[PDB]
Structures are given as C-alpha cells and as structure tokens.
UniProtKB/Swiss-Prot annotation, chain B:
<comment type="similarity">
    <text>Belongs to the protein kinase superfamily. Tyr protein kinase family. SRC subfamily.</text>
</comment>
<protein>
    <recommendedName>
        <fullName>Proto-oncogene tyrosine-protein kinase Src</fullName>
    </recommendedName>
</protein>
<comment type="subunit">
    <text>Part of a complex comprised of PTPRA, BCAR1, BCAR3 (via SH2 domain) and SRC; the formation of the complex is dependent on integrin mediated-tyrosine phosphorylation of PTPRA. Interacts with DDEF1/ASAP1; via the SH3 domain. Interacts with CCPG1. Identified in a complex containing FGFR4, NCAM1, CDH2, PLCG1, FRS2, SRC, SHC1, GAP43 and CTTN. Interacts with ERBB2, STAT1 and PNN. Interacts with DDR1, DDR2 and DAB2. Interacts with CDCP1, TGFB1I1 and TOM1L2. Interacts with the cytoplasmic domain of MUC1, phosphorylates it and increases binding of MUC1 with beta-catenin.</text>
</comment>
<feature type="modified residue" description="Phosphotyrosine">
    <location>
        <position position="42"/>
    </location>
</feature>
<comment type="subunit">
    <text>(Microbial infection) Interacts with HEV ORF3 protein; via the SH3 domain.</text>
</comment>
<feature type="domain" description="SH2">
    <location>
        <begin position="6"/>
        <end position="103"/>
    </location>
</feature>
<comment type="function">
    <text>Non-receptor protein tyrosine kinase which is activated following engagement of many different classes of cellular receptors including immune response receptors, integrins and other adhesion receptors, receptor protein tyrosine kinases, G protein-coupled receptors as well as cytokine receptors. Participates in signaling pathways that control a diverse spectrum of biological activities including gene transcription, immune response, cell adhesion, cell cycle progression, apoptosis, migration, and transformation.</text>
</comment>
Length: 105, 104
C-alpha cells in the first residue's frame, strides 16, 4: 500500500515538499514522491540538489501513469510500480539531476 | 531568494493559475515566479474574486531596473523583491487586493 511507504508523501503541496527538502541536513539526492497538484492522475518525484551558484535547490520531475499499468519519467525505461521506479533511480540517475540517495525524513 | 516562502521560481503561468485557484484560499493569496514571456522579469500572480468572473488570478509583471530595483508601477520602486512583497502586503496601491496568504 503506497500510503505507508517511507518515501511517499501523499498530497503535500509543491511548496511543502520544497520546505521539507531544502535543508542543510539533506544530501544531494534526498527525495520524495507525491501527487502532482497541477496534473491529476500524475505523481511527482522531488529531489534536492546543490549547485554552487544557487545553493540548495529542488528539481521536480513529473511521473506519468500508463493506462496499461506502469509508470515513467522518460522513454528510456518504464516501470510496473513506483517502488520499482524508486529503485532504478537509486542506482542510476539517467538524466535526473542526481541519483536518489536519501528518503526525505 | 530561492529560500523565500513566496518565491516559486520557474513555474509557468498555467501552473500558477493551477496552484492558486483554490476556492478555499483567501483573496490576495499570491506567489512570485519568473516571467516566461519577458526574460529577466518577475511576475506576481494573485487570486481575486469578483461577482461576475468569480475566482480568477491576476498576473502583474515586476521589472528590474538596471540600477537594481523593482517596480510594478511608477508610484513606488523597491530595492529588493522582499521589500515589494512587504509593501503590497500592507497596501494594494492599484493591485486587486493586498497580498494576504502565500500560496500553500
């Protein structure tokens, strides 16, 4: 049940996920998955990053759901569950700003 | 600025109208984002409600003067974006409403 997943944060707002991730305590790659407020039916992967110019910043990647079942962020690979997606990007960035290292506290 | 509660960065105009049009949000709820259309400028999107159009969002461009400051009108200029959000929280001065809540 994804409601009980560590990394899943439900209907928190875009602003609240940024408030949770932009924090000195979080590694580059701290992340969370939530519902998109702007696109019903889509999810969103928010990831903390750090670039020298802007400091700590958050990038948000939409996650679309295939009507047939899976989930995707790019045309390179698709996944049968959000857990599977979270695991692939924990191993390879594959276009994301950073590999998912840490689940947002 | 990336750390100001009200600064939403690079969202589009559709996104801000999707985050702001919430019927459970007070009039004057707002966010500052970047202008897509005008490079270098900002935009202050603000929810409003009038009898006829109902809930709607007004978008106000914020221009940065080359010396440094910011303006929405010729009456006042601000040496920083937070002084602009602080002034219009206390005075509408032509905006549809004083700024009340930051977009949730």
């Amino acid at each position: 049940s994804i409601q009980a997943e560590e990394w899943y944060f439900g209907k928190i707002t875009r602003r609240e996920s940024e408030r949770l991730l932009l924090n000195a305590e979080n590694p580059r790659g701290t992340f969370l998955v939530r519902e998109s407020e702007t696109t019903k039916g889509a999810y969103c992967l928010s990831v903390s990053d750090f670039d020298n110019a802007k400091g700590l910043n958050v990038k948000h990647y939409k996650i679309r759901k295939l009507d047939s079942g899976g989930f995707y962020i790019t045309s390179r690979t698709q996944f049968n569950s959000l857990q599977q997606l979270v695991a692939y990007y924990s191993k390879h960035a594959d276009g994301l700003c950073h590999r998912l290292t840490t689940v947002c506290p």
